[PDB]
Structures are given as structure tokens and as C-alpha cells.
Amino acid sequence: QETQGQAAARAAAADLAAGQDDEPRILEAPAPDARRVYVNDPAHFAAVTQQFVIDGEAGRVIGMIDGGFLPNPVVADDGSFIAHASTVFSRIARGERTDYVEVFDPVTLLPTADIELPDAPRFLVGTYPWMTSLTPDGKTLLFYQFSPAPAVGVVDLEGKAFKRMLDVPDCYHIFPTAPDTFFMHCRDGSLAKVAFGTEGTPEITHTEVFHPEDEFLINHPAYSQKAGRLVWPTYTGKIHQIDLSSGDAKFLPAVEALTEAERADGWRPGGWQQVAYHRALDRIYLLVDQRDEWRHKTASRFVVVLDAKTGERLAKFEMGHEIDSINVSQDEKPLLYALSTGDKTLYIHDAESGEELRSVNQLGHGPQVITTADMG
Amino acid sequence: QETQGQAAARAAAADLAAGQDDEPRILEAPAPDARRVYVNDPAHFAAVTQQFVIDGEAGRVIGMIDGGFLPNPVVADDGSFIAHASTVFSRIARGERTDYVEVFDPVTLLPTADIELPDAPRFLVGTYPWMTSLTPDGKTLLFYQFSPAPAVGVVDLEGKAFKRMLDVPDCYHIFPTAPDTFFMHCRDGSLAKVAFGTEGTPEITHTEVFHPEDEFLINHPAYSQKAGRLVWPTYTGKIHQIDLSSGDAKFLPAVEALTEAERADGWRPGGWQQVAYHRALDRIYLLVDQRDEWRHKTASRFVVVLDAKTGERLAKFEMGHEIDSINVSQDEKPLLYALSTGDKTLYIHDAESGEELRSVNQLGHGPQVITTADMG
Amino acid sequence: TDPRAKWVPQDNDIQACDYWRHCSIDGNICDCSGGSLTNCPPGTKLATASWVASCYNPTDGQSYLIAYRDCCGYNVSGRCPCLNTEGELPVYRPEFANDIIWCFGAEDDAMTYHCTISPIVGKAS
Amino acid sequence: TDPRAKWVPQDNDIQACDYWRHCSIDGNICDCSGGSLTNCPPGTKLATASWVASCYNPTDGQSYLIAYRDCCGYNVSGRCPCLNTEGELPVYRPEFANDIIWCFGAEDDAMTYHCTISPIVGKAS
Amino acid sequence: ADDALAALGAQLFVDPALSRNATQSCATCHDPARAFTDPREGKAGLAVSVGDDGQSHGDRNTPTLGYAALVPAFHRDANGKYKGGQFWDGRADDLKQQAGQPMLNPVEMAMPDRAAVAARLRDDPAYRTGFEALFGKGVLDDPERAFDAAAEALAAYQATGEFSPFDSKYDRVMRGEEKFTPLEEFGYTVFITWNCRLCHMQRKQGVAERETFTNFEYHNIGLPVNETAREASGLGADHVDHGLLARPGIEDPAQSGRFKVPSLRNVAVTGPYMHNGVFTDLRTAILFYNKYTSRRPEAKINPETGAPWGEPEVARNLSLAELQSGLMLDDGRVDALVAFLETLTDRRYEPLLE
Amino acid sequence: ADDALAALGAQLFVDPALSRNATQSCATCHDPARAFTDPREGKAGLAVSVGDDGQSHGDRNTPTLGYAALVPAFHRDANGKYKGGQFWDGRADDLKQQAGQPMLNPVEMAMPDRAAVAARLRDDPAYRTGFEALFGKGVLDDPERAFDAAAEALAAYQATGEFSPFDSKYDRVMRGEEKFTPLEEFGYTVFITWNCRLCHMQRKQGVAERETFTNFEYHNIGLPVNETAREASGLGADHVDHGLLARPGIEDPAQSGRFKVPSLRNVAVTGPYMHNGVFTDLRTAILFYNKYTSRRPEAKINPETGAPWGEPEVARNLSLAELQSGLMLDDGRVDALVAFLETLTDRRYEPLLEE
Ligand code: HEC
Ligand code: HEC
Ligand code: HEC
Ligand code: HEC
Ligand SMILES: [Ca+2]
Ligand SMILES: [Ca+2]
Ligand code: NA
Ligand code: NA
User: How far is CA D80 from CA A3, B127, B365, C124, E16, in A?
Assistant: First the structure.
């Protein structure tokens, strides 16, 4: 029942009583583990932003990172580093634009690389995790450009340099599968495979169209790079699963996250990060609620959990708060993270029972994005 | 009774029904007038900040101005321009610091000057209006430096260039009286008169000491440049008045804003901008409430109005909100502005009756500073 | 106030998030920071890029194309924030998507979001 | 909860604004953003400059000098905001003044405010 | 008189007696079968038209007469921008002032003077009857009155529903009578959301009653010279077409190289495109706009030539704010725009679409 | 035994028989009338001390023995910081290891060896009685035992309340027995808010039971050579005082030019100042710190000479993090700091405060 502030008061009181000395210093964040969780605050389009590094097990903020205008966070799965692509201007929100990538040490939070992106090439948008992406080896960062045309930027993190822009078709999102290969989702309803080398035009392959024009695939699919599992829900909660593990796209049986009866009762997914995927358990988690069809960005109060292989519902959790984004820790007995934009609070739940264990409040102005490393 | 949003909805509907055309464009703010009011939001030490330009008569936001870390706003009394001294960093709150002055056109709000301040000389502090100050002719901006020692920076607004730093004694604040002269308040309880040139040690002359070492003079005195009147409250609501209209300091009889009984009962001034002064009416306005002596920065729910010459109380207003800062318009039938840092709201009162007329909400994160022009 | 309920347009207050023209607005209503329904605030820059929705007007029973245009070059206003998504489609259908900062073509290469305007540019269909 | 009431120190929770060592704190409690009571959070820079206050400790009845030190180089934490002013004097007595950003001497010339620590540097007199 | 006047103009419109050698009428160059444009191949292809003498070619493309009656009289609006008039350079105030010019132009119909026109009108008993009934007895004996009267009838004829029927698929769709195809609807969406609508829509905002997909303004879009057309015009390699600056009374240097925004109605059947007919294909006209937005090397190349577009004929007063939109049109969006513009074809020219 | 050991030390302390020519005792250079420092004028004034031979000068200033008993034995802490010991360079582990060194140093007391010391102690019947009563019979016959016993006796004497009375005004003020003047209180507030506290306070945080205004660490503050002292010492123009690096066993080149933070107790009466006695006046020692912070031309200038402070003797490993505070001490705060440090004078030396 003792809070961290209370426990801290006793320790400070005991130090004073015992005459224990200690040097005022800069703390190191504790070693990255499976239960570390990052919360990004795009701050409702504010010119500067914040990231929160949280120990999910203790429910404690263990660090922060400043960002500029709508930064894209990435977290290396092995815990070796974190990075974002960010945007600043010479006079707050006006003047000369500088786009850049920073790489940070994950215990000191010190920038270890600051790599400027030439010609302001970042896509400025409500934060989608897979608009900026690390290769599995972690030596390359890939960012999406929308203006003047869909394009993908290649950033060498090892050599700390921007390399080049890749011309791509009318496609969106970046799902890396190898040091030299990533997938995108195209307007025509196909996936595009993009293979890029040291120099030259990329080798671009399209899959067969896997969904119709009237079937809308959300801006926040879950992608497990270690599983090569792309889990993509529609507005109705229909779930596309694409296996990319062989290096080529194989489409898994489509599955329904809601029953026909629930759908007729107006049950629909809604929020920001509406979907989570646990790799070890091969399990899908989806934010759902009763809502009108065009209220797809509102908070949801329920999470359903289902088997990826069969699509059988394993649980339905009444979350108890207005939840916008979900994600899971990738360890055994995982935590279910439930971030409320409205409350500016991360609610930390047991993923098996759905029970709320703890919460972390005061997380910026409009926190929206949850990131965790797959370290197992 | 009809709100501005309702009037605009009405007008828009009429235009649409009449087939009236109009070009989407950049609006000009209405001409600066006596009832324009500026509200600055230091945003509780956020690295970037906002100024709100408000029509006090309509209670409408007519413009905004972005700033960096704790900027100092000034407003030319003749309404010809506004300016600020501001601070930015190359990586949000870290990296290379640039201190600078911007001058703005008062209707387009476009910057007409961007003057860099060499060696990052700005005093970084919770915002005090008289830590940066225009000369009466509006040709020179004066800013305070605290580190490495008290100094005053001279910025030529006419020639759009930084001039020089002035070494001063251990003194604080800048109240300009002439194109080449300002006063400061010193630790020793005197005022310092500083008469400066383009080069050479300035002519520094101390007034006699005017207060004991245990009377505490608030960080937010009211100064009327056109009247040459410095109104300086202490923590107890005793008010020091200094007449600077002759070019030299003349000490006026001290007045008590609170009665002996009120003081015996716990009435003290408190907030941020605790005091206002109306030039034409020769009236003093003071935020007061029942408080402990060391709660001198908390909001107050009452304003006392008193005659500057006699010290006679003219009114005591019950504000009806938690008010941190007050100021007044400098015209006939003036408005009493009442800013709530907690509510993020400017409450607009009739300064004669104390009655709340209208309000302007959603004013940033922690608004604290109200500025008006004296155009009379 | 029920966030999940079918959005109900009105034609009586342009600063409220249920005003009919804001059916797919994202950000802040420009009328609340010195602009107007169809004009930008001083000091900001008007984008030429737009996103589109067909918004039903309850007054005349007609559906209009609202081409939302951004006012750019300022930090977000923080006044009158709204998010509505009537007919709003994912990013791969950008003409109908509203997470995108539609600041393209703004003067001085302004690309920061301040607020959005709501001009009618045609009848639906 | 009465902002104008006499400040009541406690010695049981360091994240609360009434914690005894926070008697003249202005800003944010460092413990709430990855620091501790007397240490800075990762990535920030510890100032050497200080402001002082005599703060009464209700555990032992002693008044201690608390030399507040800022952690600098980050935008304000926005967590556990507090403002107390026990003994706090105006700016012309700066060693007791708390509106000043006391970031002087911070590594890398860091001058932005993130949070404040509350170390004891001596007994009051 | 409105019906009778337009009937008279209808007679005049197809009468070659108004050309020096009686080889051409208004209908020769403004062919009702090709949306009131010129199907005839000349020295420069379909880019410019041949006059009455059989040799002289113009320096400008013959535009449609469809919907020209909806253009306001030439003026300068409160924003300082010139609007309206007739001719690519707006040198005629309105349709009336316009009609007599091709009559007396040596490179067109080539009549010596107004007296020569009246003399030909007088040779026709049905013109003596028609004109005298509308303007009075002896109108044709007066060169000034006859010529002015012929201009009035022709203008009145152009103002009838036949020239502006508003029966395009676009019109039918806006009347809720049918729906766009997916491709067509996508094209419309792109049209109204991309830079196109800043110039090719009547209003800045709201709904136009009789949309003709032009704001009547004058813009320099930085087009190159049409080499063969300019060669055929006889005007010389030294010659520069200054567009609106050519208009008598226009002195403003900022107007040099600007032209009237054409109406996009029937655009799919009125190729080649632009003031000098430089682009034969509709797709090329659309792709020209990418040159200001796209960083792809293909955007610098005219797909009709395989060579760079060419430097602008007038390298100032470019509408860069409108043109440099920051977004490139991919092939899919070009296809959609083509599909949309095809819906601006009047009913009777839908067979021309194939 | 505790009283007796110290009493023996008291005797040895004032005994000139422990010097070659018997002109010199500890008390000659560590004079109890001047807070255990050397009042004698030499070739370099009071900067350095003249040894037993009447000619040889040291190269370092004679520090006070007051409160030296409070310094921990020399060690390296987990933070990699060396702490404690005795001498400006900490080459002695503790008080006991220290005591024997001036006895054998040819530039000081100049006894040829331990046997020579034992012979002098043997000559005195009082020492034979006092030594043998404390250390056993025949102690003075064994040069090693006798030298060790003498050091132990002297160390024990320096640990008595006589050397560390804690009766300064500062001490009385902290007991609530009296109050600071406005100026002293301002001085104290400055001392604990400015960089001084980072080196001249026992602890990093919390309160010290027996504060002596040093953290016992080693720092190079960038002081110039004292030219007339360096000349008097005869060590040479090419000689560099490496401070802590000179301690046997320390090979870390980062320790070069670092010296033990002196206790500031009795500072007001122990002039001149620093390890080489370079600064005559207490005000000047304070003004020295402004060279790292002030931008005024005067901050570069030693007011005692009118010339620049000088190039650092060791221009590396400077404690710039602590010294470059960003804040300049104005004359008012220098006045306050002088007045505060004057409160650190032991009661018996208060009369000296006038001169
Ligand atoms: C030799 C072929 C030819 C003949 C015959 C001809 N025109 Fe034209 N017409 C043109 C060309 C070429 C232009 C463009 C000229 C320019 O813009 O400088 C034009 C322009 C016009 C325009 C302006 C339309 C716009 O949008 O700018 C109108 C109206 C017009 N003609 C009507 C007529 C009428 C009525 C007649 C019969 C009296 C006629 N024309 C005779 C070739 C011809
Ligand atoms: C700067 C205003 C402006 C913008 C923006 C603009 N246009 Fe144009 N457009 C013009 C003008 C002016 C002309 C005539 C150019 C000339 O001949 O000198 C023209 C010519 C055309 C033509 C040839 C029609 C004919 O009869 O010759 C087509 C087709 C066309 N535009 C379509 C488009 C499309 C599609 C877009 C959007 C990608 C677009 N325009 C953007 C002003 C504009
Ligand atoms: C010639 C004058 C002289 C005599 C005699 C002398 N000393 Fe010293 N003492 C010094 C000097 C000089 C230093 C500093 C030398 C150094 O740091 O290398 C010093 C240093 C010390 C220190 C270290 C204090 C500190 O803060 O580092 C102690 C303890 C000490 N002496 C005690 C004694 C005792 C006990 C005797 C008698 C056996 C004695 N001294 C004899 C001059 C003298
Ligand atoms: C970086 C740690 C550090 C800081 C900060 C510091 N000092 Fe010192 N101080 C020292 C060291 C080390 C010496 C010995 C220098 C030497 O002789 O090598 C010293 C010597 C002195 C002396 C001479 C004492 C004597 O017996 O010779 C005085 C007086 C003094 N300091 C006062 C101050 C004051 C006042 C401040 C605050 C402005 C201050 N110091 C800041 C470490 C520091
Ligand atoms: Ca044509
Ligand atoms: Ca000394
Ligand atoms: Na050609
Ligand atoms: Na000397």
C-alpha cells in the first residue's frame, strides 16, 4: 500500500537520522527490460513534445526525452538504444526547418547521434508508429515522406549519416523484414515489397490485392518484427494477418475480432493504437466499444483478446477508463498497457485477467503512442 | 446575449443563403486601441510560450504571438509596435542558445525586426514586466542581465541592432524616464538613476534609501511611464510611491491599501501582478485576500481601489474568481483586467463597479502577464 | 458529450465542435485565435492543400463539400480543439484523411499547425 | 486545499507539495520525472547555483537550510508541479528568491528548467 | 427581339460572305461539330488556325465558344487582379467588342474595313429584312451601324442555351440524376483539393450556380513557345507573346505573360491545349503542372517530345504560389483527373469522347 | 594514558631538541600565538618557512594544525576521489605518519636520522620517564620504537580540544548562544549558495557534527607559482609542484596540480594564503575565484600586484565544473564572505582579528 513518494520519504528521513551522505548527481535510468514502456505525447500538434520512459512494473517515470514537431519514436527491440525522427524550426514554429534523427543511450538518455535529414523530408502527421522504422539489425532507420510524393528515406545509424530517398509507388507505412527489405501498404490494396541496396533504384514487388476499396484498414496496425507478423484491423474489426517471416508475404486466414451479432449491435474498434500483438502467446488485443461508424478515433472502454491462429475470443475486458491506445509487454505474464489521451494517464493492467494494477498520470498534454521492446 | 460564435454562425448562414463570396485569406488584427489587452503565458517554465492579443471590449482573441523560454513582452504606449526579448535553443531545450529581440507590426503581427543578443545575456526568470522596458520615444529596448552580474543591455530598435551592455550596481528592474535614462531598485533600499551613452561608464546616482531592509518590495510594481509614477507595494500592502516626472526621484507619502483591522485579520496582497495604476484617474488597484504571510504568490479574490494622493479607499471588489494578475485599460470608464493562472482565463471587469462583464478562456497553460498600451 | 454516439450537426455556433462544417475537422477552430470561419489569424500562413468531407447542413438539408485548409507557421492555438471524422478514411486515402498536417503550399514553407478553416467549395456527390 | 492557509509541512511523502523540504520550491519535484529527492533525472544537467530556505522538519523539530538546485537542459517535466514561498524574498535578495531559473553552473551551459531537487546543506541560523 | 436577334446571329455565324474571299465563316474555325473549335490541320497541326487567304496562320489556338457567354466584362477587381473579357489575352471587353475583330483581321477573315462588311450584308435580301426589323431602316447603309449590329447579333447568338447547355455528366451528377464512377469521383476530389481549384473554379468558396471551371483571372503558368506554331504564324523568332500586357490600356509590367484561365468544359474534345496549342494530349496538359512540384526526372520531360518542356516564353509573373503546391500528381491521380475532365463534355459531344 | 600520551606530545611539540642545531621546534613554525602558523619574516615574507639551519626555505606555506585531527586517514572513495591525509599533497596517511617527517627533513628540523632523534630523547630524564611509562622500558634505546613513539605522542597532542576547541562565533551561533550580524549572515548565505560549499563543507548534503569547512578532497584551482617563494626554496625555475601526484603510489596524471582543500577555520588570522602563500590578503584569495566567472577586466588582475594572476603552475586538471559557476561575486558579497570567514576564528585568536 506504500507509495513510491512515501517510501522515498522514509529513506530520506533514515539517511538524515543516520548521518548518511550522498552526492547530488545525474541518475542513470535502470537497465532496459521487458517491462520498460515508452509513452509519446504529440501534444495535440504542439511545436515541441515529450516522451516518457516508464518502468511498467513499478509504475514509475524513469526518464524523459524532448522532441520537436510530431516526432516519430522507435525503440530497438534488444534494448541497445532508442531513437526518434524529429522536426524543429529556428523561431519556435516559424523560420528555417531542420529535420533530424537522434539516437539515445537508453540508460543515460544522452544523444549519441544527431543526424540531419536534408531538404526537410519528414512526413508531418498524427503519430503512426510504422511511419518510421528500424531494420531488424538496428543499423538502419527508415522514415516515410509524403511530399511531394510517397518516398522512403534511408538513414544509416551505424555511420551516422543520411544516405538517400527511395522512390516508391502510392504506398504507406514501412515494415522492415531484413537489413535491406521492407513492406508498405498501397492504395490499390496490395502490399509492396521494397528491396534496396547500396545504390540504385529499389526492386519493388507487389502482392495480390488482399482487400477491397470499401474495406478500410486502420492507421495503427501492430507489427512484430521478430515474428514478421503484420496484424491489420479494419474499421469493422475484421483482422488481416500477413506472415512476412519467409521474406515474402503470405496471407493468413482472415479473422473477425467481433461476432456478427456484436457488429449489428454497433460494436466497432475505436481509438488510436487500437490493436496489440503478443508474439510469444500469438495473441491479438483490440480496443472495442459500441459506437457510430464515423466515431472511429474516439476512446474505447473495452478490450477483446483472441487467438491469432483460430480467432477464438479468449477474453473481453471492461477497461474502466476512456482508453485510446493499447500495447503489451512481450514477456511472460504480460502487462496490458492502456493509455488515455483525455486523462493523460497510462493505466497498467494484467493481460491475463484485465485487472488494473497501477497507473502513471500527468503524461503531457495529449499522450497517444505506447512503445515497448521485444527483448525475449 | 448572443455569443461571438452564434453571431458568426448567423452571418455564415446568411452568406451561404445569399450566395455571397469571400476569399480565404490572412486577416489583419483590428487597429490597436485603448481596450486592446495582451496576455502572456510563461506556461510554467515551458521552453516555448504564447502571447494572446485580445480585444477587451468584445472579449475576443484577435491575434497570437509565439515566444521561447520565459520571454519579456513590451508594448509601445502609442500602439505603433509590440516587441519581446526571447530565448530559443537548437534542440528544444538543449544545445546552442540564441537570445533575440523581435519587433512586430501591431495589425499583421509580422516580425519587422529580429535582433540577436550576443553571448546569451537575458535574465531567465518568472516573468517580470519591468525586467525589459522601452524608452519613452520607443527607440530603445532595455533588458536586464543577472549573470554573471547585474547589467542592462541596450538594444537600438530604430537601427535594429544590439548596442552594448551596461555595468550597474547591485540593483534590479528598469524604469525608463528618458531616451538615455532609467531607474533601478537596489539591494541597499535606494533607487539607482542610470544615465547612459553609446560608450563610457554611465552616470550612476543613488537616491536616498526609502525603505527598511525588512519591508519587502514585490517583484511586480506598477510603473506609468507617461506619468513618471512608480507604485511599489510591500508584502503588507503598504505602498511606496515615487514621482520620477522631474527626471529625479521624489518620494511621495506612503499609503496603506489595507486598514489596520484588515491587517490584524490576515489581509495581505498576493498573486503575481498584484498592483495596477490608472494614470488619468490617479488610482491604485491591489489584489488582496486573507492569507498567511508566506503565501504572497497565491491567487487573490479581492481588489481594493484607492486614491493615490490621499490613500482613501474608493472600493473593494469581490472578484468571484482566483485572480493572480490585474491591470487596467488607460482610457475613460476603464476596464479592470483580472487574470487567473489556474483557470487559464482573463476576466474582464468594469473598473468602476467591479462587475464582471465578459471572459476570455483557454489562454495557454499558465498565463501570468497582462499588458495594455497607454494611448491617452 | 457521449463521444461514441452518432455526431449531430448544428448551425448555430461555429466555435462549438458540433458545428455542421466541422464534420471532419482535426485541430483547432481558427475563429478562436483571431481568424474566422474561412480566414486565417494574422501572422499565420494559409495552406493551399486541403482535405475534404461531405458535411450535411441540418438547416437547408443539403450536403456540402468542406475543403479544410490549415493556417500554418504558428504553434497550435490551444483554443476550441475539435476532432471529428465524418467520412474520414485512413492515410492511404489522403484526400479524406485528417491526421495529416495539410500545410503544403503555405507561404514561407510554413508547416507547423495552428488551426483549420472550414470553407464550402461545392455541393456533395 | 486552501491555497491561502498557512503551509503545513509533513515528512511522509516527497511527491506532495506539502513535503517539508519543499517549503520554498518553485517548479517541479524531480522525483516525479526519473530523478530522486536529491538527484537529477537522466539527460538533465545539475546546476551548481542554488536558492536557499529554512524549512522546518516536523520529524525532528529542526529547521534545515535547503539549497534548492535545478536540473536543467530539458523542457519542464510537467509532473508534480509545486510552488511554495516560506521565507521567500523578492528578486533583489536573490539568495532567497525563487522565480529565478537557478541553472547557472550546469554542464553544457544548460539553462532551461526541468525540475528542482531538495538537498539539505546545513542547519538554519 | 431576343429570339430574333439570336436567329440573325445564327445566320451570320455560318456565313462566309463575312470573309474577304468568302472562304470562311465563324463556323469554319469555331466548328459546332468540334465544340466550336478548329478540326483543320495546318502548318503547325491543330495548334493554330488558317485564315481566309489560305496561307496566313495565327499565333494562338482557336478556343471553344461554348460557355464564353458566362464570362464577365473585362475589369479590374478590388484585389487588383484583372478578370473577364474575351481572347486569350483579354484584349476585347466582351462578346460584342470581340465579334468584329476576326472580321477585320488580315490573318483571319480579312475584310478591308467595316464598309466592306456592310456592303456584303446589303447584298443579302434576308439580311436587309432581318437587320432592318431589329435595328431600323437603312441600318445596312451605315457601315458603323451595320458592323455594330452584326456584332450584337453574333454575341446574342453565342448567349443562347445551345452554346451553354450545362448537360455534361458533371451537370447531371450535380442534379442528383446519376453518380460518378469511382475513378471519376476520385478525379473530382483531386480537382477540388489540389491546386486546380484555385484557378479553375468560379468562386473562392460557396457553390456556383453555373460553374464553368475558370475564375476568369489571368495567370502566367510558364509555358514554352510552340516552335512550329510560332514558325507558322510568321510573327518571327524575335517575337514574344506578352499575353494580357498586349491589351491596350494595360501598362502594368506584372501582367506580362499572363493569359485568361480557360473554361475546362469540353476540354477532352478541344485539343490541342494552352494558348498556343503546344500540347496535343489532355494528359500532357495535366502533367505539365507536375513540373513545378515533382522532383522525379520524368517531370522535366514533355512525354510528347521526350525532351525538356522548354524555358517559359515569359520568365516573370509566374503564378508560383499557386503552382508550387508541394504535391506531385502520380499516374493514378492523372488518370482520375482525365476521367473527371471527360465528365465536363456536353451531351452532344460525348460521341467525340471515343 | 590518554591524558599522559597527549601530555608527552605537548612536551615534544615545544622542544627544540628535536632539531639538528636545536634552534627549532614544531612550535617555531606552528606557533600557538598565530593559530599554529609561522609569524617569522623570511626571504619570501611569510609565504614559506625557514628551517633549523637558518637558511633553507620550504616551497610550501606552513598550514595551521588547528582541526587537522578531524581529517580522515588518506584513502580513495568509491567515486574515485582521493580524500584525507596530511600535507598539502596528502603524501602522509595521517597525523602519526606526518609527525616524523619535519624531524628528518633537511630543509626543516634537519635531524640526520632516527638514531639521532632517539639520542636526544635519551639525554632528557623527563623523556626517559614519560616515554617508558607509556611504551615500556628501553623504548628510547630502539631508534625505530622511539621515533614511532614520538610521532604517536605528537599525533595524540594534536587531537586534544586545545587544537580544535569549536568555540568560534560561528559555533556559538550554531548552538543558539548568539546571532550573526546582517553582514555575516549574508556572508554565510552566500557561502552556502555559491560554489564555496562544493569544496569547503564536510558533506555533500545533510549536516556535519563537527564542521571544519573542507571536504578533504584534492583540487587544482589553477594558482600561479609564488615567484619569490619558489626562488627562496631553490627548487629551480623548471620545477613543477605536482601536488597529489607527488605522493608515492599515485601515478594518475589527472591528480597533477591538485592540493588538499584546507579547512577554513582560523583563515582570517593564518595569512598569507594558498599552498605557496601567494596571496597576502584574505580578500585577494576570495577575489581569485572571480577569475573563473567575472568578465570585468579587473577580474584578471591580482589587486596586490596590479598584474595578471598568472599562468597556472599546472594548467591541466582544473576543477572548472565547480569554479566556472556563471556568477560573479560583487564587492558587497566579498565583504560579506570576509565577515563570515572571520566568524571561523577560534575565541582565543579573536584579538588577532584586528591586525
Ligand atoms: C481563322 C479562324 C477563325 C475565325 C474565322 C474566327 N475566329 Fe474566333 N478565334 C480564333 C482564334 C485563333 C482565337 C484566339 C485569338 C487570341 O486569343 O488572340 C479566337 C477567339 C474567339 C473568342 C474568344 C473566346 C475566349 O474564350 O477567349 C470568341 C468569342 C470568338 N473567337 C468568336 C468568333 C466569332 C463570332 C467569329 C465570326 C465573326 C469568329 N470568332 C471568327 C479563330 C477564328
Ligand atoms: C495558377 C492558376 C492555375 C492553376 C493552379 C491551374 N491552372 Fe490549368 N490553366 C491555367 C491557365 C492560365 C491556363 C491557360 C494557360 C495558357 O494557355 O497560357 C490553364 C490551362 C489548362 C488546360 C488547357 C485547357 C485549354 O483549353 O487549353 C487544362 C486541361 C488545365 N489547365 C487543367 C488544370 C488541372 C488539372 C490543374 C490541377 C493540377 C490546373 N489546371 C491548375 C490556370 C491554372
Ligand atoms: C620549518 C618550519 C616547520 C617546522 C619546524 C615543522 N613544520 Fe609542520 N609544516 C610545515 C610546512 C611548510 C608544511 C606543509 C608542507 C607540505 O604540505 O608539504 C607543514 C605541514 C604539517 C602538517 C599537515 C597539516 C595539513 O593541513 O596538511 C602537520 C600535521 C604538521 N606540519 C605538524 C608538525 C609537527 C608535529 C612538527 C614538529 C615535529 C612540525 N610540523 C614541524 C612547516 C614546519
Ligand atoms: C573546486 C573546489 C573549491 C571551490 C569551489 C572553492 N574552493 Fe577555496 N580552496 C580550494 C582548494 C583546493 C584550496 C587550496 C588551493 C591551493 O593552495 O592549492 C582552497 C583555498 C581557499 C582559501 C585559502 C585558505 C588557506 O588556508 O590558504 C580561502 C580563503 C578559500 N579557498 C575560500 C573560498 C571561497 C570564499 C569560495 C567560494 C567563492 C571558495 N573557496 C571556492 C577548493 C575550492
Ligand atoms: Ca484547344
Ligand atoms: Ca596560510
Ligand atoms: Na508544335
Ligand atoms: Na611572493
Answer: 14, 21, 15, 50, 90
For chain E, the helix, strand and coil percentages under 3-state DSSP, each to the nearest 5: 45, 5, 50
Helices marked H in B4-152 = 4-18
Range of the domain at C59: 1-125
d(CA F165, CA E129) in angstroms, rounded, equals: 137
User: Whole-angstrom Cα distance, residue E124 to residue E140?
Assistant: 10
d(CA F243, CA F255): 8
Is residue E26 part of an annotated ligand binding site? yes
The answer to whether A349 and A336 are in contact (CB under 8 A) is yes
Mutate to test the pocket of ligand 1, among E67, E98, E200, E218 (most ligand atoms within 8 A of CB): E98
* Percent composition of chain C: helix, strand, coil (DSSP 3-state, to 5): 10, 30, 60
What is the domain count for chain D?
Answer: 1
Cα distance between residue A248 and residue A259, in whole Å: 31
Q: Which CATH class is domain E1-165?
A: mainly alpha
C-beta of residue A204 within 8 angstroms of C-beta of residue A192:
yes
> Scanning the structure block, which residue is given the C-alpha cell 478514411?
C89
CATH of residue C29: 2.60.30.10
Q: Let me know: does F343 contact F168? Beta carbons within 8 Å.
A: yes
* C-alpha angle F130-F133-F138 in degrees, rounded to nearest 5: 95
Q: Can you identify the CATH homologous superfamily of domain F166-355? A: Cytochrome c-like domain (1.10.760.10)
**Cβ < 6 Å from ligand 3: which residues?**
F 24, 26, 28-30, 49, 51, 58, 60, 62-63, 65, 68, 86-89, 95, 98-99, 102-103, 108-109, 154, 260
Closest C-alpha to ligand 4, atom 10 = F261
- Say if CB D46 and CB D69 are below 8 A apart: yes
Residues 6+ apart with CB under 8 A from F304: F279, F280, F281, F284
How far is Cα F31 from Cα A194, in angstroms, rounded to an integer? 86
Q: Write the CATH number for A155.
A: 2.130.10.10
Whether chain A has a CB inside 8 Å of the CB on B92: the answer is yes
C-beta separation of A146 from A123 below 8 A: yes
Q: At what angle do helices F114-123 and F143-157 cross, to 10 degrees?
A: 70
CB F243 within 8 A of CB F220: yes
Of F205, F325, F327, the CB nearest to D38: F205
**φ/ψ of residue F111, rounded to 5:** -65, 130
Place of cell 493615490: B308
What is residue B327's DSSP assignment? E
Find where cell 490617479 sits.
B282
* Chain gaps in chain B, named by the residue before each (C–N > 2.5 Å): none
| Domain limits for position A174 | 1-376
> One of C13, C51, C99, C109 is an active-site residue; which one?
C51
Experimental method: X-ray
Nearest to A290 by CA among A304, A311, A308, A310: A304
Query: Domain coordinates of chain E in residue numbers?
Result: 1-165, 166-354
Q: Does E321 contact C52 at a Cβ distance shorter than 8 Å? A: no
Phi/psi of residue F334, nearest 5 degrees: -65, -45
Instruction: Give the bridge partners for A104, in sequence order.
Output: A82, A111
Distance, in Å, from the CA atom of B27 to the CA atom of E75, rounded to the nearest integer, reads: 25
| CATH for E166-354 (3.55.40.20, 3.30.590.10, 1.10.760.10, 3.40.50.150) | 1.10.760.10
Q: How far is CA E116 from the centre of its chain?
A: 28
Amino acid at C9: P
Positive or negative torsion for Cα A117, A118, A121, A124: positive
Strands (E), F77-214: 82-83
Give the three-state DSSP class for A353.
coil
Whether a cis peptide bond, with omega within 30° of 0, leads into A212 is no
Does the CA dihedral E327-E329-E330-E336 come out positive or negative? positive
